[PDB]
Amino acid sequence: YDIQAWKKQCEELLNLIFQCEDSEPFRQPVDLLEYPDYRDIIDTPMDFATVRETLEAGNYESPMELCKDVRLIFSNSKAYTPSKRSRIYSMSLRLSAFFEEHISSVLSDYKSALRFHKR
Numbered sequence: 001y002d003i004q005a006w007k008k009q010c011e012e013l014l015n016l017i018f019q020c021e022d023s024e025p026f027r028q029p030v031d032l033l034e035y036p037d038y039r040d041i042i043d044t045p046m047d048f049a050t051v052r053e054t055l056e057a058g059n060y061e062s063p064m065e066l067c068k069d070v071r072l073i074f075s076n077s078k079a080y081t082p083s084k085r086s087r088i089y090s091m092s093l094r095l096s097a098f099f100e101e102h103i104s105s106v107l108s109d110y111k112s113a114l115r116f117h118k119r
């Protein structure tokens with residue numbers, strides 16, 4: 001029933017993601033000195049510190065918006081990878097699976113709380 005509960009749930013999931021070794025390449029914006037062509041391939045950079053800061057600033061209205069930005073971290077890695085077997089892309093796939101496994105109930109609970117609010 002709680003239409004605000006998603007925010008703390010997302011903070012806790014981000015905390016788990018930050019603790020996970022697989023998130024290290026994604027914790028901060030991609031370094032252009034390390035990957036000079038990055039912005040030729042990627043129009044909208046995204047990283048987990050930006051997601052956490054947007055959430056903490058009160059700049060997400062719903063968990064769907066947070067999801068869209070987290071999914072953009074993963075689609076950027078898929079678009080930038082030179083190979084489906086690259087180390088960083090393989091880390092993104094595991095992290096995506098972990099994220100999707102945990103965000104599912106957050107989205108479901110939010111959408112059902114919102115439907116209850118508008119009943």
Ligand SMILES: CNCc1nnc2ccccn12
Pocket residue numbers: 025026030035076077078080081082086087088089
């Ligand atoms: C997150 N760092 C940029 C980036 N995103 N996908 C890949 C794949 C290989 C190398 C670097 N990559």
